[PDB]
# Entry
Amino acid sequence: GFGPAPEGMAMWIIGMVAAIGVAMWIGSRA
Amino acid sequence: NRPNMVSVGTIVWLSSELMFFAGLFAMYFTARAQAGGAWPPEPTELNLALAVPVTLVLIASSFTCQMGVFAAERGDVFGLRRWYVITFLMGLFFVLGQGYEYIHLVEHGTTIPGSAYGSVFYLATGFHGLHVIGGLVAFVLLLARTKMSKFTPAQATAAIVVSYYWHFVDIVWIALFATIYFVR
Amino acid sequence: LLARRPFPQRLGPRWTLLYKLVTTTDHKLIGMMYVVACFIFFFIGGLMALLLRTELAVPGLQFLSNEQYNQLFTMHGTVMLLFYATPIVFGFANLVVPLQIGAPDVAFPRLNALSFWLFLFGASIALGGFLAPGGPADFGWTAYTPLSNAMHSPGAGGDLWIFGLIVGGLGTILGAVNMITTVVCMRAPGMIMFRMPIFTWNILVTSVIVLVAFPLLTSALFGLAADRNLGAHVFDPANGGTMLWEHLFWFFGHPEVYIIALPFFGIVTEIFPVFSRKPVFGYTTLVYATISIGALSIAVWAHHLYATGAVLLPFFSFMTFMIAVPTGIKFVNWIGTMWKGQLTFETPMLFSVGFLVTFLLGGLTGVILASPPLDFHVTDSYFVVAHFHYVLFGTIVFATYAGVYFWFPKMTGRLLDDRLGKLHFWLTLIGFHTTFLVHHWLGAEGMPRRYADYLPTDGFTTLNIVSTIGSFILGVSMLPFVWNVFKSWRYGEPVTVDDPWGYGNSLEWATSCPPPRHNFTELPRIRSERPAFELHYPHMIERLRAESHP
Amino acid sequence: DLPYGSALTSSGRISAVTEPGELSVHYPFPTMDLVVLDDALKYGSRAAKARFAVYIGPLGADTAATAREILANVPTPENAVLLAVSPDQRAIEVVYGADVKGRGIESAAPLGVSAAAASFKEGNLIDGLISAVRVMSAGVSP
Amino acid sequence: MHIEARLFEILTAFFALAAVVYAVLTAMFATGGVEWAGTTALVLTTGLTLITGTFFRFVARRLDTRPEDYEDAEISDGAGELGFFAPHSWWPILISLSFSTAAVGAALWLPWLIAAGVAFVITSVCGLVFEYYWGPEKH
Amino acid sequence: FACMNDIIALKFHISLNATTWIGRIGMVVLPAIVYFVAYRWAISLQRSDREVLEHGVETGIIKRLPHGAYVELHQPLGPVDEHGHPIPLEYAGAPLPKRMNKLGSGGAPGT
Amino acid sequence: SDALALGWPTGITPEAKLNRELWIGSVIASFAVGAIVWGLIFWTSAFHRKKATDTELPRQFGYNMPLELTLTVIPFLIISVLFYFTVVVQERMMHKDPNPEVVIDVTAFQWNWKFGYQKIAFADGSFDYDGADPERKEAMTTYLNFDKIETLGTSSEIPVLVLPAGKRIEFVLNSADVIHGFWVPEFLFKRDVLPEPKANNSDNVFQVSEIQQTGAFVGRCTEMCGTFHAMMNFEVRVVEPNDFKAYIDQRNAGKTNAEALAAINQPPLAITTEPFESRRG
Amino acid sequence: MSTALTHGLIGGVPLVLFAVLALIFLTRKGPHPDTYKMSDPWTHAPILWAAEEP
Ligand SMILES: CCCCCCCCCCCCCCCCCC(=O)OC[C@H](COP(=O)([O-])OCC(O)COP(=O)([O-])OC[C@@H](COC(=O)CCCCCCCCCCCCCCCCC)OC(=O)CCCCCCCCCCCCCCCCC)OC(=O)CCCCCCCCCCCCCCCCC
Ligand code: HAS
Ligand code: HAS
Ligand SMILES: [Cu+2]
Ligand SMILES: [Cu+2]
Ligand SMILES: [Cu+2]
# Structure
């Protein structure tokens, strides 16, 4: 249940979604 | 002079979910007749308290869900928004109430393994509960959608059909509560 | 004068389609995606039948294992019914039903596209169980619950089969919400509930039956997944259970059987007045025959349960003989609309006459199986496997190809070929009556279905080879149909003509081929059962009303 | 007048019908010799920015003056390069569209006739029209 | 809208008759009691055609004869606007991927992939529902 | 994903031998059939940007005309002709709007 | 006679011989009507479009209300002369009798048919074995019927069941694991065995009136069991009533079917079926 | 009979039966009209074939 494979899943769909999804809220679309 | 398509297509679909609870009642009534020599709960006891108060909340949710959809037809976006927070917080009291009924019956009685009654009690009231949680999500996806446009008649007509789903959830739970608590 | 390009453009440009397959709500394109992405599964399911027929040629386990066989007819029955035959219903519905009424699209266009992609991902989950070590579903396509436990069928793959039929099983329910509320709400001004073609009634009536059958399956499969992934005493044999599934599967089972049959009665009703130059004989009586099949199909679920102990046999006997009456009314309306008219055997008409010959023996042996003492000998034999191909390969092969060859120059604007299309028919009906006609004899003498080996002391060898000779003729017969479509998709005879078959009798033949993005540049004055016969022929309108009613 | 099966709709879209065995367009050339003639015309009108058009019809009047009326039926008779052929008369005639005169049509149109008259005699009609448009488009430049 | 509601009331009068006959005959002739698993599916399939059937009565009494019901109505009668239709959307490909990856997780029984699949369902249904109601970006 | 095939074999129930052969055959195949589908996704996005300049933003509203003739009521995003067709704009690398709510046709919900 | 019955074996019980009398009611009903409909579809192949009625469309008739009433009742009366014979015949079957004259448990376990004998009382009243021990049944804490003259039938023994050929026979149909099927094809009859038949509202049992032939016949399994579903063959033997009394008296002392069938000078292995090579190895 | 008379004829008869029907149906003079020879007075129609590229 541990190891670096659930680290990678819980990074891209939690940490980088909430880092891109914040960047899409701060920045604009042009 | 037109029959309101999106309000037609829901009730055509809400007739399907009644057949979803035709295969969930049929699991209950055949695990009651061909298996119940005694009463169907043999080591468990169903308390009507904590079950009769949380089913009076869904009755008083479909009153407030219908008194909010009266404000959709008038044009009050804020009358729609107030009563669907009354309806949302009372529907969330039901899931938090029915979820506490499970903890009273797991750590004291039977779960899905072990008893044939605990596998028809936790699926009839389990897939109903997912239709309440999936019904409370539609009260988030509608009130957050009243914040994005000018409250068109298409914003009101989608508030008709989320109300139609919540009356269906309330009617099915009347058919559940008057079967798995009173026709024991 | 009137400058035109010599031959129409064969393909499109570079990438005119790849994003039009992702972002689409066009029902004419979603129907062409149902049609193409079901003959993927007519081959994946079909190649399993040619591997399930070479083991039965020589009496012994020649090359397959014993358990590799039992997961073939499982994934042959699942893919050919639930992954081919149910979405080709809503393939011909998306091509044709918003054309046959004066409608721009379906009622909910994003549930039309979502119903396609729940199918295309729900199907590849279930047949994605071949990647598993134990292979896919080892039980039947019926999946009887002492066999479908977690210790009698322990491997996963039988768990993907359950969740391949609830994703796609949600696809047909959301696809039947469209097909009712398109018919109810979006007819043309002048189109009433009657004077509307029989194919739209069949898509209307079976969309009611989809909402009765398919939720009752989805409710049963979530109870089968709690029986396996959790530990639940639903479907456990000491609680009812092993006949709870018999009353939950077949209450889905025969209504899903009749949403395979009835929409391709509608294709068949559409074709006969086109090639026989005279209307649908008994138009209103075919409407009251489709409804009464759709009502009686739901109350007969337990004629599939005769041998398994005790059901109420005289109830499901007589109610099952009562489907022979309206299905027999629909035949006498089919010979009746074929009767006095001059009769041209083009390839849509040719395939619909092979429909009437094969489906007759499929219905004759049906009422044979409906009587329980006649069923007490053959109820899990190859007399049944002969029965549901004469009744099934007629509506789902001879009546889809009747519909593919009839609306190919309306969806693409190219006439699909007829000399090569007569080659494709006569490879099939010569082949199909070689394969399954001997199963009537071989199944009624002691060869039960779902067997892998059959012991050469038995007298089964010289009739199982006759089917295997015949079955590869059905495998060869796909070659002049795929080559017919592949050559005539982009090459092939252009149709600069809004109705290629002469006597169109519907609103789809009052528009261009292919129609525009919203189906209609005009509408005719809809004042009869067939608009494009009173359009294109004004000198018959005083004769449709007079010379009817003998 | 109208034919046997067509009908005039609510607007002027004449909706036609054809008997179920017969075809819709009766071009008397084989199908794989119309496909080769398209990408002679379509790629000839793409590389050279003109519009190549091919006419096969009777020029019953004077030949040099009748094909100007054919040129006006092309949707843009400025970049249009019309090739008229009368198979009854030996009357092949190229008509440029009075805008490709600045680019190289004067050294291509007598080359477009002789390369299509040598492929009519001891041959068929569609051999020349293919081998004219792909010849007189290399001489035309944007 | 008379003979769209009559289409379901005919189906109700059979199913509510076929559920009474089956629950009476199995009460007196089957080997045990009332055969519950099949009589529930017929008492609730006359609930399908009664929710739907007795709803179109209230859209047959409230609503007058629209030109999809009049016998000889010319084509220039309902010449107004039909309504909104989504011309294109890449959200139904994402909801089907999201519901399939919540159903692979219920098939392989991975509770971390059910919950990641359900969260994909909501954000892809939040996409498709909110799609034609956003407004521009306010910067 | 081929370095975690001790987890795909155990949790996704496929095999330990079949995951390397979908990683060996797929190492040649899958970069070759993503080159095709993305060279043809990109051009098919380009043609979507040209159906919104030549015709306009596809508004959903249909409007059956008085002789049949279902139409779509495009919003032209530019000047108009005396005839109902719009003048075609020129592409300029800038992202084009495809939806009418994004052009401010939604409005304000009331403050 | 033999061709009109599409391959049915001649029944050996008088209840199965009533099926084959009703199965050639395919002639009166199916092949009669199935030649009328062929006699109209192949009659409209002499109605082509010839080049004389080319500019003349036909009579265009659509509604003939006497014809959808005559050709509705005529398909209705044929299924009204059925649901009489197929009610009488299934009432001739499904029939019980308080002197069953042998009772045989069949107990279809996972893949090889463990038979067994219960009480037996001939019409002469001469044999009267009556053996089914309840003390063995009380070792399981059920629905199964255990007894002491059981025929096990392991994976290479292919269980042969022996029953007399002039007497009434009762088959109590149980299953240990999965729903299997019990089909001697010569008994033109089949019932699926269930795990718990009295808990599934099933009927669990059937009876044949007598057997009218001697010899030995095949038995197969029909409803799907799993992997070796094609390997579950059993094989009844209809011995004489006097040779059956000498079968049990050799078996009650305790022997096997390789020895008990040898003492009544009959081939001990199954003669109409045999074990499979694909399963033994 | 043996494994040669089956598999040499299970794959043989579907090719012989395909070769018989291909000779009957693929040589039936299809509905496309014949090629226009030059010794023929051009009784068809005027034909204009403008390309649609620019
Ligand atoms: C959970 C895992 C992930 C965790 C990460 C969480 C954070 C990720 C997103 C962060 C968002 C930015 C935060 C600030 C923005 C605030 C909104 C605002 O004011 O302006 C609107 C803002 C305006 O943007 P703009 O710059 O002005 O211009 C946009 C234009 O107007 C119009 O623009 P448009 O036309 O182009 O389209 C707009 C929209 C396109 O439209 C949409 O799609 C809307 C999406 C709605 C989001 C729904 C909720 C998100 C998560 C759902 C989880 C449900 C629980 C499931 C649990 C299962 C248990 C069994 O596109 C976006 O906004 C980009 C959003 C990117 C997120 C997509 C998620 C992808 C993967 C989802 C998996 C989630 C992880 C699961 C892991 C396992 C489970 C734990 O728009 C938004 O950004 C909306 C974002 C919606 C997120 C709101 C919720 C915050 C998340 C925290 C949740 C915890 C609180 C809830 C409990 C407390 C109760 C009181
Ligand atoms: C395309 C899909 C299908 C259609 C349509 C269909 C029609 C019928 N079926 Fe079926 N079917 C059964 C009975 C009928 C009956 C009575 C009809 C009817 O709808 C047939 C329609 C009748 C006609 C079209 C004839 C009318 C024509 C005229 C001219 C009227 C007068 C003629 C008469 C009265 C006949 C004269 C003969 C007499 C004996 C009176 C039974 C058993 O009673 C079983 C289970 C066997 C078992 O025990 O497992 C069964 C099994 C299946 C299975 C497989 C399930 C499995 O594997 O377990 C499938 C897929 C299937 C599909 C289909 N089936 N059927
Ligand atoms: C509409 C539905 C159905 C069709 C069509 C159908 C076709 C056939 N069937 Fe069947 N069927 C049987 C024989 C055949 C034969 C010979 C054909 C023929 O039509 C054969 C059709 C074959 C093809 C059409 C193959 C063409 C493809 C070729 C020549 C090459 C493809 C190449 C590639 C590369 C694939 C392309 C891949 C891509 C991804 C593009 C047999 C016995 O030999 C059994 C019982 C097994 C047993 O013992 O119980 C059986 C069982 C069933 C069952 C019961 C399932 C069960 O018991 O669990 C159903 C429901 C059913 C339906 C259907 N069946 N069939
Ligand atoms: Cu049935
Ligand atoms: Cu068995
Ligand atoms: Cu078996």
Remarks:
- Chain A touches chain E through four residues (CB under 8 Å).
